[PDB]
Design a protein around this ligand. Structure first.
Ligand SMILES: NC(=O)[C@@H]1CCC(=O)N([C@@H]2CCCc3ccccc32)C1
Ligand SMILES: [Zn+2]
Length: 140
């Protein structure tokens, strides 16, 4: 579990969105595993606007933050899980690292701010859903 809280937005994995998220929906994209809902309180996270390929992510299944090198956001084939059939996931970045399903939502960040959140994994790989291209998170 986990979310990004920026301005009056809450960014969560679409497969973990609550009824309150769907009832206050701003934007959702199944192919990216992302959903954004509106909040009453203002959040403290800042989104990175960069092309960094090194950062640090939070792994709840180890209670640890790990430094990682990660690939550029791309269209990657992800195997079937309990939440999605086997399909291509877009805007996904991979790194070598530990990840279990419940690790989804952990933040990946760099020197500029939040880059994305854990969305995929298994077998010593961890995949992050990028949010750096969602410029509208910084306004309205
Ligand atoms: N985004 C997707 O297509 C799904 C979302 C839910 C989900 O459990 N995953 C994978 C399954 C394999 C292990 C694993 C480890 C860590 C995190 C996520 C996963 C991918
Ligand atoms: Zn950066």
């Amino acid at each position: 579990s986990g979310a990004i809280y920026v301005g009056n937005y809450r960014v969560v994995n679409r497969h973990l969105a609550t009824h309150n998220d769907w009832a206050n929906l701003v934007w959702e994209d199944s192919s990216r595993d992302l959903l954004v809902s509106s909040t009453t309180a203002q959040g403290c996270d800042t989104i990175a606007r960069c092309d960094c390929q090194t950062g640090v992510y939070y792994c709840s299944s180890r209670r640890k933050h790990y430094p990682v090198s990660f690939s550029k956001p791309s269209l990657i084939f992800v195997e079937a899980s309990e939440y999605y059939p086997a399909r291509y996931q877009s805007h996904l970045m991979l790194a070598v690292g530990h990840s279990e399903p419940g690790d989804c939502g952990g933040i990946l960040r760099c020197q500029h701010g939040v880059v994305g959140i854990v969305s995929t994994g298994g077998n010593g790989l961890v995949g992050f859903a990028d949010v750096r291209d969602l410029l509208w998170l910084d306004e309205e």
